[PDB]
Structure 1
Amino acid sequence: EVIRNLVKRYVAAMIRNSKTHEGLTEENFKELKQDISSFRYEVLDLLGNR
């Protein structure tokens, strides 16, 4: 029972420590850029006029 609670707390802390530990990389910038490009292309499908 104690081991079960310790693992639960440890897993949350490690998942917590990652989101504040390391900075951004090139893979994050590429991912963010692709999100806008996908949104731009999808929106441009509904062209009211041209």
Structure 2
Amino acid sequence: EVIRNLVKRYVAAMIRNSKTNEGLTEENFKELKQDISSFRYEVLDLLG
């Protein structure tokens, strides 16, 4: 009953620390570039 709580708030603290402490990289840049690119071709395909 204690270990379940410690594991649960441990894993919550570690995903929190991965959100705060991970610096951005090139593949995260490619994800935004494909989101704007794919949304671009989708809007151009609806308006064409």
* TM-score, normalised with respect to structure 1: 0.88
Residue of structure 1 equivalent to 2:30: 30
Larger radius of gyration: 1
Structure 1: which 5+ residue stretches go unaligned? none
1:47 CA drift (Å)? 2.3
Structure holding more helix per residue: 2
* TM-score, normalised with respect to structure 2: 0.92
| Number of corresponding residues | 48
Aligned-residue Cα RMSD (Å) equals 1.0
Structure 2: which 5+ residue stretches go unaligned? none
